[PDB]
Amino acid sequence: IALTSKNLRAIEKVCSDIMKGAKEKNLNVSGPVRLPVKTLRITTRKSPCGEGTNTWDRFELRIYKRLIDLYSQCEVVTQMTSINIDPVVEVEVIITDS
Protein backbone atom coordinates (compact mmCIF):
# COMPACT_ATOMS: atom_id res chain seq x y z
CA ILE A 1 0.00 0.00 0.00
CA ALA A 2 1.81 3.04 -1.36
CA LEU A 3 0.44 6.57 -1.55
CA THR A 4 1.53 9.52 -3.68
CA SER A 5 0.68 13.24 -3.83
CA LYS A 6 2.34 16.66 -3.96
CA ASN A 7 1.34 18.34 -0.67
CA LEU A 8 2.37 16.98 2.71
CA ARG A 9 -0.72 17.63 4.85
CA ALA A 10 -2.93 15.26 2.85
CA ILE A 11 -0.43 12.42 3.02
CA GLU A 12 0.10 13.09 6.73
CA LYS A 13 -3.60 12.90 7.59
CA VAL A 14 -4.27 9.84 5.44
CA CYS A 15 -1.25 7.98 6.84
CA SER A 16 -2.44 8.90 10.34
CA ASP A 17 -5.84 7.39 9.54
CA ILE A 18 -4.13 4.35 8.02
CA MET A 19 -2.10 3.44 11.08
CA LYS A 20 -4.99 4.29 13.42
CA GLY A 21 -7.08 1.74 11.53
CA ALA A 22 -4.16 -0.69 11.61
CA LYS A 23 -3.99 -0.39 15.40
CA GLU A 24 -7.77 -0.83 15.55
CA LYS A 25 -7.67 -4.02 13.47
CA ASN A 26 -4.57 -5.37 15.30
CA LEU A 27 -3.11 -6.88 12.14
CA ASN A 28 0.37 -7.59 10.79
CA VAL A 29 1.61 -4.17 9.61
CA SER A 30 5.04 -3.28 8.27
CA GLY A 31 6.86 -0.15 9.36
CA PRO A 32 6.40 3.24 7.70
CA VAL A 33 8.54 4.18 4.70
CA ARG A 34 9.85 7.75 4.60
CA LEU A 35 11.33 8.36 1.16
CA PRO A 36 13.70 11.21 0.25
CA VAL A 37 11.89 14.07 -1.46
CA LYS A 38 11.82 14.18 -5.26
CA THR A 39 11.62 17.65 -6.78
CA LEU A 40 10.66 18.79 -10.28
CA ARG A 41 12.29 22.11 -11.21
CA ILE A 42 12.11 24.11 -14.43
CA THR A 43 13.49 27.55 -15.25
CA THR A 44 11.84 29.89 -17.74
CA ARG A 45 12.44 33.35 -19.14
CA LYS A 46 10.21 36.28 -18.17
CA SER A 47 9.46 39.27 -20.42
CA PRO A 48 7.27 37.84 -23.23
CA CYS A 49 8.95 40.13 -25.77
CA GLY A 50 12.64 40.43 -26.58
CA GLU A 51 13.24 43.71 -24.72
CA GLY A 52 14.77 44.47 -21.34
CA THR A 53 17.16 42.78 -18.98
CA ASN A 54 17.23 39.00 -19.36
CA THR A 55 15.36 37.82 -16.26
CA TRP A 56 14.51 34.19 -15.55
CA ASP A 57 12.56 32.48 -12.78
CA ARG A 58 12.66 29.00 -11.26
CA PHE A 59 9.91 26.62 -10.14
CA GLU A 60 9.65 23.63 -7.81
CA LEU A 61 7.22 20.75 -7.23
CA ARG A 62 8.00 18.44 -4.31
CA ILE A 63 6.38 15.03 -4.86
CA TYR A 64 5.66 13.01 -1.72
CA LYS A 65 5.11 9.26 -1.62
CA ARG A 66 5.36 6.62 1.10
CA LEU A 67 4.85 2.86 1.45
CA ILE A 68 3.23 0.58 4.02
CA ASP A 69 2.12 -3.05 4.20
CA LEU A 70 -0.86 -4.69 5.90
CA TYR A 71 -2.10 -8.28 6.24
CA SER A 72 -5.85 -7.92 5.74
CA GLN A 73 -8.60 -8.48 3.20
CA CYS A 74 -8.07 -6.52 0.00
CA GLU A 75 -11.76 -5.58 -0.19
CA VAL A 76 -11.92 -4.32 3.39
CA VAL A 77 -8.69 -2.32 3.12
CA THR A 78 -9.76 -0.72 -0.16
CA GLN A 79 -13.14 0.18 1.38
CA MET A 80 -11.64 1.67 4.54
CA THR A 81 -9.24 3.70 2.39
CA SER A 82 -11.78 4.90 -0.19
CA ILE A 83 -14.06 5.96 2.68
CA ASN A 84 -11.55 8.46 4.09
CA ILE A 85 -9.16 9.31 1.23
CA ASP A 86 -9.17 12.51 -0.84
CA PRO A 87 -9.19 11.66 -4.59
CA VAL A 88 -6.18 13.99 -4.90
CA VAL A 89 -4.03 11.16 -3.46
CA GLU A 90 -3.18 8.04 -5.47
CA VAL A 91 -2.88 4.76 -3.55
CA GLU A 92 -1.91 1.26 -4.70
CA VAL A 93 -2.13 -2.01 -2.77
CA ILE A 94 0.26 -4.92 -2.18
CA ILE A 95 -0.61 -7.73 0.24
CA THR A 96 1.69 -9.55 2.66
CA ASP A 97 1.53 -12.96 4.32
CA SER A 98 4.39 -13.45 6.80
Partner RNA sequence: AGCGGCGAGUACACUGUACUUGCUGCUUCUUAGAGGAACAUUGUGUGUCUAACACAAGGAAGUUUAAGGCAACAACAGGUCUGUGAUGUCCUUAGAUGAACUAGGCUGCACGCGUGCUACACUGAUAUAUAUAACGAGUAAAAUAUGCUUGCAUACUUUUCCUCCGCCGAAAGGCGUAGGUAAUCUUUAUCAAUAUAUAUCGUGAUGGGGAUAGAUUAUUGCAAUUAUUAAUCUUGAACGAGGAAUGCCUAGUAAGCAUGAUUCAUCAGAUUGUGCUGACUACGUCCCUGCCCUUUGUACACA
Between residues 53 and 98, which has the closer beta carbon with respect to other proteins? 53
Cα(26)–Cα(46) distance, integer angstroms: 55
Under rule CB under 7 A, residue 92 binds RNA: no
Asked if 90 touches RNA (CB under 7 A), the answer is no
Residue 25 vs residues 12, 51, 63: alpha-carbon distances, Å: 20, 65, 30
Question: Could you tell me which of 91, 96, 95 has the C-alpha nearest to residue 14?
Answer: 91
Using CB under 8 A as the binding rule, whether residue 44 contacts other proteins is answered as yes
Q: Residues 24, 57, 92, 97: which binds other proteins (CB under 8 A)?
A: 57
Determine, following the binding rule CB under 8 A, whether residue 6 of this chain makes contact with other proteins. yes
